[PDB]
Design a protein around this ligand. Structure first.
Ligand SMILES: *[C@@H]1O[C@H](CO)[C@@H](O[C@@H]2O[C@H](CO)[C@@H](O[C@@H]3O[C@H](CO)[C@@H](O)[C@H](O)[C@@H]3O)[C@H](O)[C@H]2NC(C)=O)[C@H](O)[C@H]1NC(C)=O
Ligand SMILES: *[C@@H]1O[C@H](CO)[C@@H](O[C@@H]2O[C@H](CO)[C@@H](O[C@@H]3O[C@H](CO)[C@@H](O)[C@H](O)[C@@H]3O)[C@H](O)[C@H]2NC(C)=O)[C@H](O)[C@H]1NC(C)=O
Ligand SMILES: *[C@@H]1O[C@H](CO)[C@@H](O[C@@H]2O[C@H](CO)[C@@H](O)[C@H](O)[C@H]2NC(C)=O)[C@H](O)[C@H]1NC(C)=O
Ligand SMILES: *[C@@H]1O[C@H](CO)[C@@H](O[C@@H]2O[C@H](CO)[C@@H](O)[C@H](O)[C@H]2NC(C)=O)[C@H](O)[C@H]1NC(C)=O
Ligand SMILES: *[C@@H]1O[C@H](CO)[C@@H](O)[C@H](O)[C@H]1NC(C)=O
Lengths: 118, 132, 231, 231
């Protein structure tokens, strides 16, 4: 709701084994669940009615139902389901690179022609 | 009476549909279509007061009520493509026969306050025009 | 036994759903296609990779080279002018390609099943018809609910020119056979047609049993002296 | 080029409308020109007539062997073996044919125009459809009233085969656009399909207006002093 835009935002994953539970994966005050170090981020764009959260580096373990929380007076809780299908990523970078102790670096990142306008 | 096809509020028309699947002759069944029209007996032709006589001719084109003039999203292979939905969606312009409970309708009238005239604004539907 | 060089456009499938508008410059009928070079008038990704000399009618050689590039300049209206530097002759031959002009946009219609198929209660036929379009390329797919049906379940014909009421326009057709049980239950079907003259490149029509020609019609006219508001 | 001998079957367009079904056993690929002539296996009352040759890729030859003896012994069940002999490798080639069995009938549907076209006062469009027949030979005509329309006012596609389980079947379409003044007058139109497995060799289907007109229409006028509508 737009009239409580100064709130705190959460991102919890449905466990669903004993009774149902949301372990908190990330928040707005800068705390990450340590298993998700490097592949989770909550962002504030576009604002004014919405916000985004980005989950990459997908394996087939991540197929689950996800919930979003805020500490506002009114509580909309919305459910998103992530599936996993067959294919390969559009962007391309190598495997996790190394670097020298004290010398320059360069890392490419491809993108196909659908992403040329962007 | 169970699934709604259109509910149009500029002309106040509503069209529903239902399959009346009976038991005798278990191979044939009918399809019913209900149309409801509410006719306003005291509105003007343009919705602004002094213009024209009260409207006396009401015309409903069912090919225009039923159309969908807006894009939509389709997933073809592994993609999200934006499609249109009709062959007739070029140019609001449609004349409205009734009001609509969720929209203001205001007018402009000149009056006198000693010297100059003014540009008084006037509510035509007073329930919908509070500034909130 | 004779040279003749042609230029083929990009396709429609890879340029609408994607944008990877590769080109191809190839002639067939040479004499000594072993060492040769090719010309393309601009070049950015200059790795125009060679290929094997696939034989043709009565066994003469054929060149093979692909020009890359994608669908922003072909949409903007550029030009490409590939010609040859053959090992078999003395003065080359020229051909060019551009985006097509004076384009009309199609009209899509979906036709419900015929009446006598609904009595026999095995399988019914849908018919998608697309009409009046000046370039000769088109795409036709099918959807059930929101799921794309795979391509082996429907039959689509080719594109041919209709009788000429002044200017040359074309036509295409397609059919799909589904089960009578789930047409009577209430599933919905769609035919999605994509041609480049359309403004958003695609258009869709959806049809189900409830939104069709009825057998019963009830009409109610209510005269309201109270108000003119329509709640 | 390369030598090959094949042969044809008589065309349906004058097998059902006449009795001049000329067969053909033509060979193609000959180092020298025509010096060959033929021999047919039955004794059908005439012998073959040979025509002047034609040109092909780089110098290949082809002549024809027409057997005009069609007093219909073909659907009677004969076999009609051909035999040619050329100044080439000394093997006089052979060729078979049979008029096959395992046939099926087609099922013909004639569809009414879509609604958007009707509400626009221009040309309206009609659709014929035939499907399910076992050999891929068929004819499609049209009729307005009783006069047959000339064959350059309608478009018809090829005959392709439809995906199913095992038993191979084929399909074919055709369209025809008439003026809306002709439709709303009350003139009828007909599709007509010729096929070999039909018992009387043809099938009609006729459409006009009043086709799917509804059976019931209720009109109720609720005057004020009685208004009670619901949300
Ligand atoms: C139905 O009646 C209304 C009321 O007149 C018509 O709307 C308005 O018509 C006037 C005609 O003088 C237009 O005048 C404009 O006024 C504005 C003031 O905001 C001024 O900035 C302009 O330069 C011009 O003088 C006005 O465009 C128009 N629309 C509004 C106020 O929204 C209406 O056209 C009538 N409908 C029909 C179908 O006749
Ligand atoms: C239509 O033409 C085809 C060939 O173009 C004919 O089919 C062939 O017929 C021959 C003899 O009738 C078959 O040869 C067989 O060889 C075996 C040896 O394994 C032998 O044991 C048999 O007694 C017989 O001689 C051959 O299999 C067959 N098929 C081919 C070549 O694919 C056919 O006869 C012609 N139609 C008519 C009506 O004659
Ligand atoms: C990407 O490769 C690097 C290379 O190891 C991994 O990053 C860390 O590497 C150090 C030293 O090799 C280890 O001590 C850490 O345990 C690694 N981090 C983690 C989270 O395991 C990194 O794991 C690789 N990326 C992924 C997604 O596995
Ligand atoms: C493309 O090659 C053709 C060769 O067939 C060139 O031909 C001319 O095309 C223009 C149309 O753009 C005509 O107005 C001329 O009359 C054509 N010339 C002749 C002799 O017929 C053409 O020059 C090439 N395209 C460009 C852009 O130069
Ligand atoms: C937020 O969205 C509403 C919706 O119309 C808009 O009126 C408002 O101006 C927007 N606020 C900002 C800061 O963009």
């Amino acid at each position: 709701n737009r009239k409580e835009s100064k709130s705190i935002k959460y991102w919890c994953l449905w466990e669903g084994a004993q009774n149902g539970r949301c372990p908190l994966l990330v928040d707005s005050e800068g705390w990450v669940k340590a298993q998700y170090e490097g592949r989770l981020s909550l962002l504030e764009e576009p604002g004014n009615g919405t916000f985004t959260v980005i989950l990459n580096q997908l394996t087939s373990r991540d197929a689950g139902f996800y919930w979003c929380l805020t500490n506002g007076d009114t509580l909309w809780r919305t459910t998103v389901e992530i599936k996993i299908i067959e294919g390969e990523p559009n962007l391309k970078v190598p495997g996790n690179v190394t670097a020298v102790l004290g010398e320059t670096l360069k890392v490419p990142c491809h993108f196909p022609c659908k992403f040329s306008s962007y | 009476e169970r699934i709604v096809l259109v509910d149009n509020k500029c002309k106040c028309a509503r069209i529903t549909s239902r399959i009346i699947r009976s038991s005798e002759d278990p191979n044939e069944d009918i399809v019913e279509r209900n149309i409801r029209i509410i006719v306003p007996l005291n509105n003007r032709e343009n919705i602004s007061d002094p213009t024209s006589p009260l409207r006396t001719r009401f015309v409903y084109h069912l090919s225009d009520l039923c159309k969908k003039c807006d894009p939509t999203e389709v997933e073809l292979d592994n993609q999200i493509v934006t499609a249109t939905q009709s062959n007739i969606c070029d140019e609001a312009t449609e004349t409205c026969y009734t009001y609509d409970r969720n929209k203001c309708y205001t007018a402009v009238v000149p009056l006198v306050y000693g010297g100059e005239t003014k540009m008084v604004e006037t509510a035509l539907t007073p329930d919908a025009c509070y500034p909130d | 036994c004779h040279p003749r060089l042609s230029l083929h456009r990009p396709a429609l499938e890879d340029l609408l759903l994607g944008s990877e508008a590769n080109l191809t410059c190839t002639l067939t009928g040479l004499r000594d296609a072993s060492g040769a070079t090719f010309t393309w008038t601009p070049s950015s990704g200059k790795s125009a990779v060679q290929g094997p000399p696939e034989r043709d009618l009565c066994g003469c050689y054929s060149v093979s080279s692909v020009l890359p590039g994608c669908a922003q300049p072909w949409n903007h209206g550029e030009t490409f002018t590939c010609t040859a530097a053959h090992p078999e002759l003395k003065t080359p031959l020229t051909a060019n390609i551009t985006k097509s002009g004076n384009t009309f946009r199609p009209e899509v219609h979906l036709l419900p099943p015929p009446s006598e198929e609904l009595a026999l209660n095995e399988l019914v036929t849908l018919t998608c018809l697309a009409r009046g379009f000046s370039p000769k390329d088109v795409l036709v797919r099918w959807l059930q609910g929101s799921q794309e049906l795979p391509r082996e379940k429907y039959l689509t014909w080719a594109s041919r020119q209709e009788p000429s009421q002044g200017t040359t326009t074309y036509a295409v057709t397609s059919i799909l056979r589904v089960a009578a049980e789930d047409w009577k239950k209430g599933e919905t079907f769609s035919c999605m047609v994509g041609h480049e003259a359309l403004p958003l490149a695609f258009t869709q029509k959806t049809i189900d049993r409830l939104a069709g020609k009825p057998t019963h019609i009830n009409v109610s006219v209510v005269m309201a002296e109270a108000d003119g508001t329509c709640y």
